[PDB]
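Exam prep: given the inputs below (a chain plus JWQ), describe the expected output before reading on.
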Amino acid sequence: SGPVPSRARVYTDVNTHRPREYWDYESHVVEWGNQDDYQLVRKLGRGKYSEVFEAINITNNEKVVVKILKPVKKKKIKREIKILENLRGGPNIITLADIVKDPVSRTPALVFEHVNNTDFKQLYQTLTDYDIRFYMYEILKALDYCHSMGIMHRDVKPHNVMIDHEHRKLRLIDWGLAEFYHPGQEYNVRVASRYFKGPELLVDYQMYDYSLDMWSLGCMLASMIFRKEPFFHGHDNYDQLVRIAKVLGTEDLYDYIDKYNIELDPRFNDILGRHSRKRWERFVHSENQHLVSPEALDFLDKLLRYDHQSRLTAREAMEHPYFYTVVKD
Ligand SMILES: COc1cc(/C=C(\C#N)C(=O)Nc2nnc(C(F)(F)F)s2)ccc1O
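Solution:
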């Protein structure tokens, strides 16, 4: 009895066949740079796990960004550092430039390339149909890369997608929640922002994979093309699943949990209800129709599936007709 196991349908065995040093981040040995190379200019932001500063690298006169990690498990720190080093140079992956020991926090400070960002409230108010297709494709490059390298991001959301719109430059950031995918491994479901959490997380299914990121990407896409941010706006993790079910319907939710022999929290008995699956056209109106096309809706439809094994992979997504109009390098 109990839930049915699951495996990724792609990149299943990447970490199996890479050497142990690649994924065994607990044994990684950090090469420290010199903290005096970087002069902090201003604080950019603060989160649960870090503070971020604009800085100058006074050895080359280049702007950088410094992420000073808040005290946390050595394991979580080494995990992020190892993942960043493994992915460095990949398409639209934020580039780790240095690692220093901050003298005040006495924790690692990660030094990254500087991206001249516009925060996603003003940007998302402007982006055209063409812009959204372009930047989605750029996100997909990053996701196929990290998935192909055995890593799931697990925190895909607008805040973690930096865009310097002037230079049409995109970087996927904050790999602090990212993990190595190992077939059969059970993972923490307390990942991703509420609004971007996949159904697998919301029904407490731990044996998930790269396809989690594709659900999150779908949530981003829906918010952008329908001009509703966030799209699934739950007030807590339970209501989050109810909001999803009011769109995707309850019958396919039950098919999903029945497939994996998953049982819903009895707390859903009085709040879930019975809901038909809705057609995506109902979210189209005169103020977002310029961002919507049959191709957009089909693409969105193929990302937002309950069954994590049924979602487009990043590579499959890049083959979708939605991207036919995007100029390719
Ligand atoms: C929060 O985690 C990260 C954050 C960042 C970078 C930024 C953040 N947050 C970042 O560069 N933010 C900026 N905000 N304004 C910038 C400006 F105005 F200087 F362009 S950069 C890079 C890697 C990370 O893992």
